[PDB]
Design a protein around this nucleic acid. Sequence first.
DNA 1: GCCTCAAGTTAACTTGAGGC
DNA 2: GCCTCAAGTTAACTTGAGGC
Lengths: 121, 121
Amino acid sequence: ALLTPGEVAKRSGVAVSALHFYESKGLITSIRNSGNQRRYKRDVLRYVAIIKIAQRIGIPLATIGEAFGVTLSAKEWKQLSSQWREELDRRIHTLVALRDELDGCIGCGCLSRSDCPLRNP
Amino acid sequence: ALLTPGEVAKRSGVAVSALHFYESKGLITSIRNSGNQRRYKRDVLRYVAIIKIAQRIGIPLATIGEAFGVTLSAKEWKQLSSQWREELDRRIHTLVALRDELDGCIGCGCLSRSDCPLRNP
DNA sequence: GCCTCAAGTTAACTTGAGGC
DNA sequence: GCCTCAAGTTAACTTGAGGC
Ligand code: FES
Ligand code: FES
């Protein structure tokens, strides 16, 4: 059967307004019933779930749509997951570089413009 | 001598509007000259520099003020730097946990609510 | 409850109008 | 150039008004 906006909201843990928004930003799809009311394809649950994991990764909605294209496969998941495991990685290396630079500069405090890592990344 | 808003903007690499804002959010201080124009205590350069390093760490302005109290020592720097090297750390561990959880779920794609890490953090 | 659409919210600022 | 203050900008939504 098709899910009503309300249901999807409970099983997703997102506001119905959140679903309206995601659809307007084209991250989920709808179908209108005999009374213009939206009805969702179970699949939506998986997407929303993915939207949230993507958010945790620190990925912006626009980009999450930019990855969604415009019906969810096994390949797709592998395409996304990896594409994110990568950023999650780059991002981490970036933060780690900092932590190293930072540890050196703790006994310093000079913050030399032309000579300190922390300042000239 | 005292620095003019313009100078401080060039040596900081921030908009004069940025300096106005930081001061209003109480992260830097000013002194008005005979014509109500602001004049800065060189020290401001170090703060701004710190505001930016704090931002890189991923710290919010409010919090950066929350750490600044309301005249910059050696102890202060150690108080801040550490206090940030810590968050920079917690944050990293969080991202790393994800990356691990994520790697397991790549050959899966089940996204079992009551059974997958990625979903129930 | 569900639908629409306008406007408000936080963050970190920027842009613009008005005036010296 | 610098000063003030009101309003605009992006992001991710939420709140509210109005109507079925
Ligand atoms: S604190 Fe001196 S080089 Fe970074
Ligand atoms: S992808 Fe199946 S448990 Fe996470």
